Amino acid sequence: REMHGKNWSKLCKDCQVIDGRNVTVTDVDIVFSKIK
């Protein structure tokens, strides 16, 4: 298995994450941006 996550694990590739319990985003022009 190229990517293998077991008990409560977290994995990502080519990823943009804002993982978190309380997340607030305010008065932003662009939050995520991925260009390819």
List the binding residues for Zn(2+). 4, 12, 15
Residue 17 amino acid letter: V
Query: In angstroms, what is the minimal distance from the CB of 6 to a second copy?
Result: 5
3-class DSSP assignment, residue 8: coil
Query: In angstroms, what is the minimal distance from the CB of 29 to a second copy?
Result: 5
Cβ neighbors of 25 (< 8 A, separation 6 or more) are 18, 31
Which residues would be at the binding site for a second copy (CB under 8 A)? 1-36
